[PDB]
Symmetry: C2
Subunit: 249 residues, 2 copies
């Protein structure tokens, strides 16, 4: 099981800032990442640039979203054919901001995930429940649906290229705040749902990385990683400056 | 009233192809565009690149989509702040592929359009009805709604930066085929709806460019431009190779 520290740059950075961050990362992170996998997700407008900078390093670049098609007539969308051409082979699916602000359903996630995994991409699939869902007792039902419907029909032989993240959307500026034990109990559940997904899923459920996607910072990373089923972080704000990002490793 | 020939590269091109097309365009189109405005819309992954190539030329670059926010926490989205930084000041809203495959509503179009126009961008707003809408007699109701709800609350002083396109989605591989008179009667209607949008809209309705977005090719462009209310093209396939694109001017 890999430990992964993934920085999500969201739509927060200028191209100037992205390029400075990329160079800073390339100079520092490979020397301190050690056993941990380093990953970054720049805005699509900046991917080509950032990708050229990080070429030759151990820092993996991913896209924040894509559409489930090769080159074709889909105005506004990015194709995995376009990403592959610039060496980007990781794509994020189902981020809470996309589910909430862009109306992405489990089913649209599933079509992305099927396409990406069939075509040799790594997928970083995000799940998580809102405060209203949690307050209504729907944590289990929502997570279980996100996993089952998100991963429906995916050939088990492709799960080696699937990474999960749990976003405690309920604590995300709500301002409930999530403890490492609260995160742990969700990660254990999620891992148990993977173990039930298809016949013979026992080994895959134990090797799959499940990253924590709530608030992750140098001051709480070690406490999160100590939890048995937490395998890293999908990190927001702290990933967007070199000093905080480097502090995670 | 400007005549505009806008090429939509959709998600159809590799970065290699986009860069070759950009250089080809820069070398040829400025010498033949003459009175016509030339515009291109590359995939977002390629915009930085293409934008650098076309810098200093008369060929205008636009984005195929964006979100209605400055830099902020919207995973997967592109900000007009990011576009402005690389000199892209035109954004397309409401393309039929986005309405159909990405579920974009009139209201989500309206929020994009309000944000873009408030912040000194030019907007290329696409409208059009499906075969089922047309067959049901909803052409008027659909177009009228797309315009009224799309442009709700937009300060009239910003309409100078609004361009329209009509996509005859009903004829778009359906395979009904649209004549220049059929296009004309829609463009005249659309122009009449703009003239009713706000008090004193008479002059703006006569100066606004309304581009035809059905099948546009060197062999039918002159027949389309002869129609009284057709002011250019938003062009798909023919825009994606230099010889066909140059044939439009």
């Amino acid at each position: 099981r890999k430990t992964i520290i993934a920085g999500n740059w969201k739509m927060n950075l200028s191209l100037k800032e992205a390029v400075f961050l990329a160079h800073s990362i390339r100079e520092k992170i490979p020397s301190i990442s050690k056993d941990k996998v380093s990953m970054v997700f720049p805005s699509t407008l900046h991917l080509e640039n950032v990708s050229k900078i990080l070429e030759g390093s151990s820092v993996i670049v991913g896209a924040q979203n894509c559409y489930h098609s090769g080159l074709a007539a889909f105005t506004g969308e990015t194709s995995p054919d376009q990403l592959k051409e610039i060496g980007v082979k990781v794509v994020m699916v189902g981020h809470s901001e996309r589910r909430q602000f862009l109306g992405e359903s489990n089913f649209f996630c599933n079509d992305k995930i099927r396409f990406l995994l069939k075509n040799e991409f790594t997928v970083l699939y995000c799940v998580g429940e809102t405060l209203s869902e949690r307050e209504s007792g729907k944590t289990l039902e929502v997570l279980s649906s996100q996993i089952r419907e998100g991963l429906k029909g995916i050939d088990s032989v492709f799960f080696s290229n699937l990474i999960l993240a749990y976003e405690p959307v309920w604590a995300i500026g709500t301002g409930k705040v999530a403890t490492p034990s609260q995160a742990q109990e969700v990660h254990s559940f999620i891992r148990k749902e993977i173990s039930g997904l298809f016949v013979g899923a026992s080994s895959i459920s134990e090797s799959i990385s499940i990253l924590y996607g709530g608030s992750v910072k140098p001051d709480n990373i070690q406490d999160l990683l100590k939890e048995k089923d937490i395998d890293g972080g999908l990190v927001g704000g702290a990933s967007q400056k070199i000093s905080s990002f480097a502090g995670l490793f």
